[PDB]
């Protein structure tokens, strides 16, 4: 319910996805 | 209200900004 | 909240992968 | 939530390491 925590959550998922794609 | 969780949220957003700027 | 919990697990995985990537 | 707290600690470490790796 903290918009900062929910947003950082979504963004942290986004970040790891981008890292894996660049690693593959 | 947990400063640890709030700070890591802020930091995780900054980290993705830095990652994308290195990518761009 | 399962999104926060999911991001938590994912962030832990990310640092492990990044560390191994530089190891 | 100890999981979210653990992942908060790790996320802060992660960026510390990432910046030092670039310096
Ligand atoms: C970005 C990631 N380290 C997160 C971001 C937010 C704060 C912390 C838990 C969860 C949501 C994941 C740490
Ligand atoms: Cl990287």
UniProtKB/TrEMBL annotation, chains A, B:
Bilayer-spanning residue ranges: 3-21
Name of the protein in question: Matrix protein 2
Tree of life domain: Viruses
């Amino acid at each position: 319910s903290d918009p900062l925590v929910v947003a950082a959550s979504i963004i942290g998922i986004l970040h790891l996805i981008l890292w894996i794609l660049d690693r593959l």
